[model samples]
Target chain A: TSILDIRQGPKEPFRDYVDRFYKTLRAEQASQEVKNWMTETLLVQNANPDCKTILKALGPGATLEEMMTACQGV
Target chain B: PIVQNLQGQMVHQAISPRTLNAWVKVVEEKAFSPEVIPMFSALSEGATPQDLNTMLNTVGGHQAAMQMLKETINEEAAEWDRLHPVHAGPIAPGQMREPRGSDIAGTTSTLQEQIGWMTHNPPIPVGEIYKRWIILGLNKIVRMYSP
Candidate 1:
């Protein structure tokens, strides 16, 4: 639903652009740039509200430090 | 299509897999460039592209965790929320003032040690920092609404 969202797409050749994007999706994963590209892409986009609702419930109480404490025995 | 060097290696290959999949983001972005250009005059000159990136990349560590946790927590949290919605409130934060004298505003070495420990744990995922980014990102989003 996200990648296919026509709402935030470009004005020209939109279908073509997204099509090629999906093509890239069909490809493999190995190089670092690919990794970097995805990570960078993430930086560019905003996280939506639904995501926020879920994570906050996880709470600051569940910080990484807290995670370690809980997992110490596991 | 382009030549590049990476981590001390030289070669041309398609971008890596993690990124390729990440393109599946909800908001499809421009070709990683500015969208709305400034229509108004300058206000004390802006941070350089490199500087802006450095600043955000400083943010990148947490974003990594944020993204990683989104998938994991979303799956589990959604279920939990369905059963029980813990009352939380509006969460929006980006105020980066210089570190005040408050211990509440600082991280201790012990805390750092725990983060180092938990973040390095097995099954922590290969993109350690990326996962952290997801974690950080999720907090920002969750902080925006009332519970």
Candidate 2:
């Protein structure tokens, strides 16, 4: 089965954190709805909670990398 | 008259199936230029022009629309992101911050291999290739809450 239960590791550095989500997006077969779900999920649980506002502000089609850039310095 | 019927047809076309949450997200994020002003009047679900004008005035009109859009996105986030969170809290001191409930060791190679495996999988969506904008405009603007 495709693994969909992924979460960001706290020990993970920001770059890997971002990259991991990108890969997870593939591995999980994430749809537009699920991608938006992942974006918000990653934001609040992120090492930085500050992005919950702006990152989620992005539209439905926004990428995890773009969400990362919008929120994290990475 | 033909004119009245045609206007009704236009209104029918203007009523998009997507929600304000969807269009506002696109607009606030600059997916559409400010020049697409009429869309602000067109894409609202069932609002008449007079109703749209009232909201424009109520929410401080076009100047304050972005702020309104920002507020709308937050409200929308609260609606959708409320359940099934995995992160319990911050990582404790001195412990490596592994993802909660995961069994795989946080190995560098494993992570790298997974990403390499992605090449065999399907590609991610590329943005903004449409010749015409999806959800061309907002049909109406209504204030759901106060600023």
Candidate 3:
């Protein structure tokens, strides 16, 4: 029920890893909410230091676009 | 009955240390019989009868072989990227697979990149790498049959 088990491969880049992460959930026909939660969790665990800091500062209830903006800003 | 893994795939086992040696063992059973002479003649530089040469042969994934070839130049992904760059980030939602041409071209470029290394080092040590791959492929096929 959770995508927390998904992890990045050491040799894989950030974007490739995320695409694969999303693909797994996409295959499950996960709901938009579930997809968002999964993506958020993936970033929380794997994003760069600045991106993660910005995300944490945004608090819970942050939208996907907001998370993306923070990552972009960093 | 040989039970197959549900997710397992059946495909040609390409060049591995074992498979490469297996390929040689299977082919050399004829002891370089006249039939295979013409095939051996296609080598670069020059060749002799019964040479049974396996140079220029590469390993699967072509991945590791590709990496080593790049190392002869410089072991940086960007350098390899400039040679066999991946343009698109990833396959799109509806895209079924990467184009075969991409891999075909990547291999072609890997050669030029290696040759580029040779220019600086006057014949890079490929004979050893070739031998290394051969041993690996041979070992794998042996264990496969024995196990």
Candidate 4:
């Protein structure tokens, strides 16, 4: 499935959504930088509101890993 | 001791001094008037409300300073809320659950527990209490689900 087609489901747990995103990414070939960039964009843009707050509070320049870890809280 | 605890919590959360400094710098640049600089300076130094009001009177009276402070705080809070809208929903099944009573109790108890530890024996300054509450509250929310 295309990464663009991955949207966090309304009922999906944040961690589960993250795992699905990474699984999709693993099947695609991209540089680490590009992967990290896309991961940040997708997670921030797609997260539920509560989770979004937690992620944004991490401030700019946070990595994908940081985003994932923060998601566990929500 | 208060500042040390505040700084330690910030560090624990991976918040950099540069980020906080940047916020202060922005506030300084956008201050309603230069006369209010001392008011803000006093605030950062943990001045009391009475002291802030006295300083405000010297600037342009409390009205303008109060208005400016309200607007500044509201704008920041609004921006934050905008970036992270509260979910107003008939939440889907299995979606992230809202904080339940148990969760609330747990968070509250934990906060009280930590505050007691943080304030044991030597009483902390009054100003320090509010500062500690704000940071501790945020820290708890951020890591609420972590093991």
Candidate 5:
């Protein structure tokens, strides 16, 4: 019996999360330096109205939980 | 079923390496030549012949060919793995590739930002970091494929 809302966040600091994610994907090595660059990406997406376009790229059944995991749990 | 894996994807057979290599050459010539640039100038959204040509022209010949090779390999591997079961060891994700007009919804940026996000020496660098993305920004015009 689970009644948990997975769309929650209070994870590690933004920079740590981004670094962990990059490392997990093997896209880049882990670093504390890339946070600003990553945040800018989020900012730009927010500016764009069609947010789901990105959602689609994450995949058809992507969720916030998946995204968090995708981002790498540091 | 002959099973194999590369970068965590199941290999897709039926697409031969010879055919793959041939397409790679074709893609390289088209992507890097100046002759195709003017035509790419009018690229629109989705996979049209012109859009492919635009990618061909802008991303440059060799790198474009490389991208083509990578893409072909990933698809081929993914499909093959599915059809043929490899009951061996664990698999790992190799390179990460985002298709043309590739974007993550949460990932947003102007060209400058993309330049920052992009790996400076992307294992391939014929043009400026901006150039790969000029193709990237404009890449939206390419049509989505079944894969």
Candidate 6:
């Protein structure tokens, strides 16, 4: 029920996960920094291995917008 | 031998469960300095020393690294306070509240209450907080270098 507990479902699409993440973040009123950090962390941590490989190429400082765009190709 | 083995795993990008388990043992044994453990954890996870070296160089060495971490931690703490104003305890009656925009920005007394929370029982140590933030940053580096 907490913002920390949001994760991509096993059968969920990346778009769906992104939707849920944004909804939860907005409801929690998280700071911009936390929103960015959590978005990047959760997206990478829950990505499939193939998607992760792509994200790995994006480097540590990749922004959420960049990550979202990268996931589109996967 | 453990340190050398860790280095080998990093250089070769061939981390095994055993390598990380040995790292846990070393951690329990307190074999490494606290400041270096996050870097080692990052390496064991997937970051190379060169990646860390580059980060350190960009930040201007260990001193700047530590300073940056502290600043990040404090910022997060402030954000946490803003989000959890209820945990900051009750506002005393007649206390002057600061106005922000069109509304009152909670209570001014909340600041003292937050300080009391930090200073009282179930106290959280800054070193532990620093360790966690450092490891989180290092894990991001690992993610970049992984795969």
Candidate 2 iRMS, in Å? 15.4
B68-108: candidate 5 lDDT, tens digit per residue: 33344334434544654554465446533331222211122
- The DockQ score of candidate 4 comes to 0.01
Scoring only the A-chain of each prediction against the true A-chain gives TM-scores of: 0.25, 0.44, 0.51, 0.74, 0.24, 0.62
Assess each model's interface with DockQ, reporting 2 decimals per model.
0.02, 0.02, 0.01, 0.01, 0.02, 0.02
Off by over 4 Å in 2: A1-5, A9-11, A46-74, B1-147
lDDT of 4 by residue, B1-147 (tens): 123354454111223455445435644565444433343444435323222233323332223223333334334434544555557868777443333222222222343333333344553343333333323332433343234
Q: Is candidate 4 or candidate 5 better by TM-score?
A: 4
Full-model lDDT for every candidate: 0.31, 0.37, 0.42, 0.47, 0.34, 0.47
Candidate 5 residue-wise lDDT, A1-74, digit = tens: 11111112344333333333333323334364564354334422432223324444566444332433343322
lDDT of 2 by residue, B69-118 (tens): 43343343343234324456886674333221111111222333322222
TM-score of 1: 0.16
Candidate 1 lDDT over residue span A1-74, tens digit each:
34323221223222233233433432435476775464335312422343323334555434432322222222
The interface root-mean-square deviations, each candidate in sequence, come to 14.3, 15.4, 19.4, 21.6, 12.0, 14.7
Provide fnat values for all models in the order shown.
0.00, 0.00, 0.00, 0.00, 0.00, 0.00
Q: Order the numbered candidates by TM-score, best leading.
A: 4, 6, 3, 2, 5, 1
- True-structure lDDT of candidate 4: 0.47
Among all candidates shown, the one with the greatest lDDT: 4
lDDT of 1 at A58: 51
User: Candidate 5, which segments miss by more than 4 Å at Cα?
Assistant: A1-47, A50-74, B1-29, B32-72, B87-147
lDDT of 6 by residue, A1-74 (tens): 78667666555555556556655655667677987687657756876676677789989876543565676646
What's each prediction's clash count? 26, 10, 8, 0, 20, 0
Model 2 residue B147 CA deviation (Å) reads 40
